[PDB]
Every structure is written in C-alpha cells, then in structure tokens.
C-alpha cells in the first residue's frame, strides 16, 4: 500500500529521469511544423501521439473524428490601403501574411481611429467616436473576439490589430501573426451541439460570430498608418512614440478581407488509465496539438507535457504499484487555435456521459512561457489543492517553494475565453485548472512563425527544469485527485466567493433600497450554504474512510457542487456558458452587477425588469445549491 | 395586369444593374494598385503633370518601375523602403 | 424509437428531396438497443448481494428518463423538455408535424427549423444511448 508521501517521492524520482526538451525538439521537426488544424502534419502528430499512447500500454487508447468549419486565407489577398479623399493617390500599406479567422469577408473604407486595447473602458474614454470608422487596436489584454465585439457595439466598420514594440519587443517589425474573432468556443457553425455527421450539419450560426472585417497587421504597417494620422497617444497607454490617434482629414483607410470557410476533419486522441476502485469517475488532462505556425510554446510544450505525464503515470501503475482509485484521461485536442474547437465539441458530444463523472480538468497549454512568475486560474474547488501543491513544489530557478504569497487566492484571475479549461468550467460544470510559469509580459511569438524551439530554448535556457516543474505540478494534481478515497475538492472555498458577491452589491445598496428590494434573502442563502458546507465537513470528519458506502454518498454530494452553479434557467444551446460565477451572459453575477451599475448613469441604459429577474434567478440558484448540498429534500429548513 | 408586372420588374432589373456598374476614378486607381501589387497609384490632372511627378519620383528613387498611363501613374517597387520613399514623394510633391 | 422512425417512413421522399438521410436514426436505434441489452445482461450476471455493482447499474437505470430531456432548450421558457412527452419544437411530434407540413405544400413548412429539429433529436437519442452504454471510452462510435 502506497500513501501520498511514497507517490510524491516516486513521482519526483520519475520526473528526474525525464527528458522534456528532446520531445519538444521532436515536435518542432519538419514532419510536424507547421500543423494547422486539419492539415497533414496535424494528422501525423496525432498518429504519433496515438502510437505513443499505445506504446505506454495505457488501459485504452482511442480517437474522435470531427468535421468542423474553420476559416482560411483565399487566393485573393487581404489588403490594407490608404486612399486620399481628393482621389489623387492610393497607397498599398500592406498585404498581410497573417489573418483573423472567422472574420467577415468585406471591404470597408473610412477613418482610422486608434483604440488602446479595444476594452470597453478604452472605448468610453475616447475623444473621437468610432461609429462608421475603422478601429486600430493593440493586442495583449483581451481576446481578438472581445476587441471586435466591443468595436461592433459602437458600430465600427472594421478592426485592425497590431503588436507595438513596447508590449511586444520584437526586432522584426514586419512579423505577421494569426488569431480568431469568434466570441465563443467550438465550431461556430454548430453552436451547442456536436460537429458529428449524425446531425447532418444543419444551418446554424453562433451569435458570437462578428459582422465586421478584422485583420492582423505588422508593426511596420501600423507605423506606416500612423504616418498618416494625427494626435499623440495618451501617456498612460505606455506605447511607442510613433503612435497616433486619428487619421488626417484628407486620408481614409480601405480594408479588404476575403477569407473563406473550409470544412476540415480534426482528430482528438485519447488515452485512459483505469482506476482500481471507482473507474467510472475520472480526471481529464488535455493539451492543444494544432498551431498556425510552428507553435512550440503554444502547442509543443503542452503536447510534450501530456506525453510525458501519460508515460510516467503508466510506468507508476505498471511498475511502481500505483493504484489510483479513479481513472485518468489524457487528451490531445485539435483546432485549439480557432477557439478550443476540439475540446468544446467533445464536451458537447459526450455531455451526457461526462455528467457527474468527469470531476476535474487540467489544461497544459502554454504552461512554460517564462520563469519569473507562477500564475494559476482555476475553479475555487481546486484552490486548496493548488495551495498544498505550491507549498512543496520548488521553483525551477530559485529553488524556493512556489507558495510565497499567502493571499494568492484573492488575486486569481478567472479563466478566459481563449483558455481550453473555460468550456470545461463554464459549460459542463467540471472544475478546471490552468497554470503557467510566465513573465509579466506576454510571450511575443504566440501566433507567429517565430514560435520555434530555438526562440524558446534561447529565452528559457532552463527549459527542461521548468517543464519538469510544470509536470510535477500537474502530476501532484492528478495524484491528489485520484489516489485517496477523498476527492480533495474544497467546497468551503465557495463561501468566500459568495461573500465577495454581496460585498460587491453593497456599493449599490441605495439602488436596491429605492427599487423596493432587499438583500436579506441573499444573506440567508449565504448562511444556508455555509452551514451546509460545515455539516459536510463534519460528516467527512466523523465518517469511516473504509466504509465505502458513506464515503460514496458524501463524495457524490461533493461532485454535485460545480454542476449546481450552472444556471438552470437558460438555454444551453444559445448560452452555453451557464456557470453563474465563471460563465458569460445575463445569467451570471458579473452581468447582474454591470446592469445594476447602469442605474447610477440616469439614462435609460439600466433595465429594471431584467435586473429583478436576474436577482431572483441568482438568489434561487444559490439557495438551491445550498439546499442540494444540505442533504435529503425533507431535511431542508425553511423560515 | 401581369404583362405590366413583368414590364415593371424588367425595368427595375435594368435600373439595378445599371447603377451597379458605376465606377469612380479612385476605383480604377485601386484596381491598378491591386492588380500588380503596386505601391502608389497617382491620378494627375493631365499627362504633363503625370510625367513630371513620375520623373521626380524616378530621380529620387531610381529602382522604381513607373507605368505612365493617361494621367495615371503606377509605381512598382521591390522593397518597402522604396515604397515608403515613393509614397512620401508622391504625397508631398 | 421504432415507432418514431416508422412515423418518419411516410415522409421518405421529403427526407430524400432535402438531401437528408435516416441512416443515423437507425444507427442510434441500434446503439440504444445494444445499451439496453448489455444493461440487462449485466443485471443478470451481477450478484444482487454486491451493493456497489447494483448501485452503479441502478444509477445507469435512473439516468434513462433524464437523458430524454432536451439539453438544447431553455427550461424556463419551455419547461416540458421531454422529447417524447413534452411540448414545443424540440419534441418528436413537433418534428413530425413540421415534416408533415412539407407534403401539404403550403408555405407553413420551415426547412431550417426541421433540419435543426432533426439534428437535435438525433443527437439526443444518440447521447442517451451513449450514456446508457457505459463509460465514455467504451463508446463504439465511428
Ligand atoms: C458618428 O455618429 C455621429 C452622430 O450620429 C454622426 O454625426 C452625425 O451626422 C449626421 C449627418 O451627417 C448629422 O445630422 C445633422 O445634424 C445636425 C445637428 O445640428 C442637424 O442640424 C442636421 O439637420 C442633420 O440632422 C448629425 O448631427 C451628426 N452628429 C454630430 C454629433 O455631429 C457621424 O456621421 C457618425 N460617424 C460616421 C463615420 O458616420
Ligand atoms: C461526414 O461529413 C463530412 C463533411 O460533410 C463528409 O466529408 C465530405 O464528403 C463530401 C462528399 O463525399 C466530399 O466532397 C467530395 O469531394 C470529392 C473530392 O474532391 C469530389 O470528387 C466530390 O464531387 C465531392 O465534392 C468532401 O470532400 C468531404 N469533406 C471532407 C472534409 O473530407 C463525409 O463524407 C461524411 N461521412 C459520412 C459517412 O456521411
Ligand atoms: C429589458 O429586459 C427585458 C427582459 O429581457 C426585455 O423584455 C423582453 O423583451 C423581449 C423582446 O421585446 C421579449 O422577447 C419575447 O420572447 C418571447 C419568447 O417566446 C417571444 O414569444 C416574443 O415574441 C418576444 O420575442 C421578452 O419576453 C421580454 N422579457 C421580459 C421579462 O419582459 C426588455 O426588452 C429590455 N428592455 C430594453 C429597453 O432593452
Ligand atoms: C423558421 O425557423 C427558424 C428557426 O427557428 C426561424 O429563425 C428565427 O428567426 C428569428 C427572426 O425571424 C430569429 O430571432 C431567431 O434567432 C431565428 N432562429 C434561429 C434558430 O435561427 C425562422 O423565423 C422561421 N421562419 C418562419 C417563416 O417562421
Ligand atoms: Ca458544436
């Protein structure tokens, strides 16, 4: 019988004898780069991962075949041109080599107005309105889809995206890069249902698809455009001196995007190590395999980590006597560059099978981007598991433990649309975690042709050691989640979250008071949820861990925690991200807070009936989660 | 009554298709630019001004390939440096 | 399920003129029959004194009715989500009535709505079969 200490020591022993850089270098060979989604080299890498999973002698290796619609470049070249409104001269600014997937194919001409990052606060604090004009923005703070959506909300006719040197210190000013502008995940032409032949692919378009053209441009093209623009960019933007704000009166910009849809076949590769007690419950570990360019940091690191973790855990089970109570699924996704399409469509295809069975997802994408900071974004249910992991895993460079800030949990940023763990948490209600060794700046070569192994090994000479540390974090996650009779999922964490919610409501108390409403029911629901969590912890303490039946009941009640925060009053097809804490849409608590914020601004932007329904539905979601956690239906106490 | 309907819709079709072939001088300039991936297309008022501006650009940028066409001038370059120089010259001269 | 596909037979030509096929419905029917047959076989081969194997099989039994609730519809605006016994455009009778409107050549037939109905019903049935078949890795779909 092996305990946690034995498993930790053997895991570290196997991590010492693992060569990650060799597999990273193999994934950057010419037979695998570039590996655009659905390409021949993508399938070659999929076959290699499948054969590696078979050679590790996992419990079962299989695959999933999807037919999804992506967007690629057309024979017609996208163009950014400058036209003189006198009509006397036209000037080709750039024929970009990159593009933005899911952009609408159109040609638009108008003024070019500079927005800092495309955020809503950037647009609000802008001198020149953007309605009817083209917007140029920097990348770095939000996804391309969020930028395009914010631009469309103000009736902009086009979006240009570039990488300034201050945010992206790249020597090559003519470097192209790639992205996508779909405000969502998965195949945007099968919104909410799997991209399988059984559906016979009916006509349906995701509401997150933009209706304006958006194109990526080089920094040289951005400076050429600034040459025809006026006005200094604000100092707090902290960008280059060549930055300008609005085009001159005599100059307009013509943007031509002609990207075309393309139906492709993508493969999702899977391997499973079955549990020894409860093999029907499982953790999922996934990594993106596709990439526009070489994708060493974007795809190679994660895929190498997946392969190494699968190999090491298979060796621990077959040779070291590791007996996990629950199963472990290793997944190589494709079409991740288009919005986690493979993972989202797998979730939509097997939601009925994953319901209350898959209890944790661990993402490995972009886990090694630097060495200064260790950043994590996860559901609160995993926070404790993260803390205990950070308190005994040492930094790859400094040698100290990763746990240096005791108030880290209050500074965690929630999962974003571009992260593969976001559809796991917000749509299917599975606790998800993403982590990375990174810098304060963004990795500059993501989505470019310079994301190669040379640049990665040059920026991170300790690449092997950092990859080992990331693999150790992931492996300790897996061991803690699968080795014992207890799940190590901390439901009590959500108490803290609820507190924050009502505190965020306090700044609008007066509004709540003049609409004839009260926050008393929310505080009563908080009390019920806190008491339910306390009763569950007491029952876990008083229970006998060898009594499988009592432990089974308590662990099922634990596994229903994340699911009960999915909004039961919204259509999962039109609003897939149903999680009231970490989803998107008018059913979430942040949406309630933004709608309530609009009441101070005394114009008609505040919607009172919508807010009343939001408050009612959020209150009963919280209260029903507390009631379900408290036990049987007849043991629920009502005032 | 139906004969008048077909007559009306035929005249409406002729109107729509006649409005759609309405080109500007800038449209032809953009077509010249996009056809050969030119850097600058300049529309002069006369062939003399076109020749003079083209010769000035050729003097400052010798490597440029100039196509003089009526009062249109098409500048094709091999590098972005020459494109920037030609654009500055044509826009400020 | 048999009755359902038989109710579809009277519209073969329609399904054929819209470029659609009923093959996926028959494949889902076969998958569901396979899941039910193996569940009965597992009940027969299991020992009733083993509390946990019986608990797992009984949980698979208790998920049968839930998996027929439409997972693509808002429970607030269309609470009767059951594709067999509910009301709304997500039910099989609504699909049949919409397909019925195509023979009776008025302009009441909505082709895009029918395609979405067919896709969502087909995958509801297929997902119920997959969930009843067992673990996610033991689904034989290709
Ligand atoms: C961005 O939005 C603004 C505001 O709608 C647009 O400017 C607006 O343009 C229209 C017509 O060009 C103006 O209508 C005129 O308004 C004057 C106001 O005194 C009125 O006296 C006239 O009878 C006529 O209705 C409108 O006022 C004007 N708004 C402002 C604030 O100037 C602008 O065109 C939009 N941008 C683009 C690129 O279209
Ligand atoms: C499942 O759906 C996919 C996607 O709709 C089907 O793949 C597609 O099948 C069509 C028709 O067989 C292929 O088009 C054909 O291409 C050939 C080669 O150029 C041409 O000779 C034909 O005239 C026709 O255009 C299409 O290429 C193919 N798409 C992909 C990405 O492979 C697939 O057949 C469906 N499977 C089943 C079992 O129904
Ligand atoms: C403020 O928010 C409320 C709530 O969302 C908005 O009221 C909503 O208005 C829409 C459209 O007027 C209604 O949609 C309806 O949907 C049913 C669904 O079956 C359909 O049958 C109707 O034909 C219509 O499309 C919706 O019922 C209604 N909701 C409520 C609670 O009243 C309101 O429009 C928003 N105000 C502003 C200024 O945006
Ligand atoms: C046929 O059915 C489709 C699908 O329900 C209807 O499309 C809807 O159109 C309305 C506006 O007309 C939109 O608000 C909805 O978003 C559409 N639904 C979908 C699923 O896209 C269409 O209106 C129907 N046609 C007729 C004539 O009733
Ligand atoms: Ca889908």
Residue numbers in the entry:
A (entry chain A): 121 to 759
B (entry chain D): 1 to 93
C (entry chain B): 618 to 759
Sentences copied from the publication:
We sought to use our protocol to design a human transferrin receptor (hTfR) binding protein. hTfR transports transferrin (the major carrier of iron in the body) across the blood–brain barrier (BBB) via receptor mediated transcytosis, and this process has been exploited to deliver therapeutic payloads into the brain parenchyma that would otherwise be blocked by the BBB. We developed a computational design approach for designing binding proteins with beta sheets geometrically poised to pair with exposed beta strands in target proteins of interest. We targeted the region surrounding an edge strand located in the hTfR apical domain. This domain is distant from the transferrin binding site (which is important to avoid competitive binding) and is exposed and therefore suitable for beta sheet extension.
